[PDB]
C-alpha cells in the first residue's frame, strides 16, 4: 500500500565508514525493506546467512533491526562468525551462537588504499578479558600487564595497544581491506517494525 521505503542506500552508499574498534549503531523503524536491489553490487560479494532462507524475508514481518558496519583486513572474514575463537572475535567483536540474520562482505580496494598507504583503521590488542557479544567498549587507557603499577608511563609490560593497519596500494588478498556490514534484526514479532 504505502510507497515509503526504508532508508538503506545512505548506509550502503556512505560518505565514509567506521573504525575497527567502536561502530555506529543505527536504528530503522516503520518502513518497508526491499533487499533485491542489494543483489546489485561487485562480483566479489559474500552473503551467507543463518536462521532463515536468504530469499524468504520480504513476506516476513518481524521486529526491529539494528545497523552497523566496518572494515577488516582480508583473510579473517571467516574469523568473524558465531562463537569461534579469534583475536578479533574475543577482543573486538563476538557474535552469539544462537544468532539470527547474517552479514555482507565485499572488496573496497580502490576506494580505501592510497599509494603511500592510508593509516586510519586500528583494533584493540591487549584486552584482559573476553567481551560478551554485543556490548559497547570504547576506551583509550594504556594496557597494564598487572603486577606492579606502571602508573601511565608506557614502559615495560605497560603497553599502549592498537597498532593500526597498513592498507598498501597493492597487496595480496590476504591483507586486502574488505568492507563488512553486520545485520541484526530481532524476533518475537510483537513490536512488529519493518515487514513487507
Amino acid at each position, epitope marked *: 500500500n504505502i510507497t515509503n521505503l526504508c532508508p538503506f542506500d545512505e548506509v550502503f552508499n556512505a560518505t565514509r565508514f567506521a573504525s575497527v574498534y567502536a561502530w555506529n549503531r543505527k536504528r530503522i523503524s516503520n518502513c518497508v525493506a526491499d533487499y533485491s536491489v542489494l543483489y546489485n553490487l561487485a562480483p566479489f560479494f559474500t552473503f551467507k546467512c543463518y536462521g532463515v532462507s536468504p530469499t524468504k524475508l520480504n513476506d516476513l514481518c518481524f521486529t526491529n533491526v539494528y545497523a552497523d558496519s566496518f572494515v577488516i583486513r582480508g583473510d579473517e572474514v571467516r574469523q568473524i562468525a558465531p562463537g569461534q575463537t579469534g*583475536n578479533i572475535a574475543d577482543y573486538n567483536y563476538k557474535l552469539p551462537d544462537d544468532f539470527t540474520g547474517c552479514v555482507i562482505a565485499w572488496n573496497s580496494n580502490k576506494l580505501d588504499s592510497k599509494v603511500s598507504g592510508n593509516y586510519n583503521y586500528l583494533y584493540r*590488542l*591487549f584486552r*584482559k578479558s573476553n567481551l560478551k557479544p554485543f556490548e559497547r567498549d570504547i576506551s583509550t587507557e594504556i594496557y597494564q*600487564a*598487572g*603486577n*606492579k603499577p606502571c602508573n601511565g608511563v608506557a*614502559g*615495560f*609490560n605497560c*603497553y599502549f*595497544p592498537l*597498532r593500526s593497519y597498513s592498507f598498501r596500494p597493492t597487496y595480496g588478498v590476504g591483507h586486502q581491506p574488505y568492507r563488512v556490514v553486520v545485520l541484526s534484526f530481532e524476533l518475537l514479532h510483537a513490536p512488529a517494525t519493518v515487514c513487507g
Partner: antibody
Amino acid sequence: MQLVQSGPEVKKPGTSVKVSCKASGFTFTSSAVQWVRQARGQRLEWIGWIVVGSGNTNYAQKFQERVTITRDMSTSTAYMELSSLRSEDTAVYYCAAPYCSGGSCFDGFDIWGQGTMVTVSS
Amino acid sequence: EIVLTQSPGTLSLSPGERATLSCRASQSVSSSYLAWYQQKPGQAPRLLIYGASSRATGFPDRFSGSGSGTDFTLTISRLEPEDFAVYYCQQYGNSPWTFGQGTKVEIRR
C-alpha cells in the same frame, strides 16, 4: 620451559647473518623477547628487545643500524639479521623471554637459551 | 645512564660470610625495574632477584636484599659451596637497557 636456538656457524666475514630463537611451554600469544651479546671473558652488552603484539623495537647506540628482527609468529620462533657486524663479534648471543599465560604474567626474564657459536676468520 | 660500577670487585671469602652486593644507579630507578643475574661458567645466567623485591620461583633461600633508589644492596650469609661465581646488575625502565659490570667471589688459600 623449552627454548631452542640455532647451531654453530663458521661463517665468512661480511655478507649477512641468520639467528633464531624458538620458544615453547607457555602461551606465546603475548610476551616479550630479548637479545644480548656476550663474548668469552668479556662484558655483557644489550642488543635489542621485541614481542608478538606488534613489530616494535629499539637498539643501543652502537646498533641502531644494520640490525633487524623478524617476528615470525608461526612455530613460536623469531629470527634476527657482516647484521654487518665486524670481525670482532665472535660472541654468544643467547635468547630471553618471560613466561606468560592469560595476559598478566611475570616481569623478569626467567626462560633463557643455551648459546650459539658464530665465528668469522680466514 | 651507565655509571653502575658496583663497589665490590675482587673479594675472597670462606664459608660463614657477610657478602654485600651493591649496584649503583645513574638515576633513581623505580623498584621492580632491577635484576640480579647469576652466571656460572659454561651456561646461561639465571634470574634470582628482580628489583630488590623478592626471590625467584625456585631457588635457595636465606639470601635476599632490598636497596635504595640509587644504592641497591643484598646480603649473602653462609653460602653453600657451589654459589661461587659471577653476578650481574640488570636495569629496566630506561632505554637503552644497559647492563652491569660483574662481581667475582672466591676463597682464601
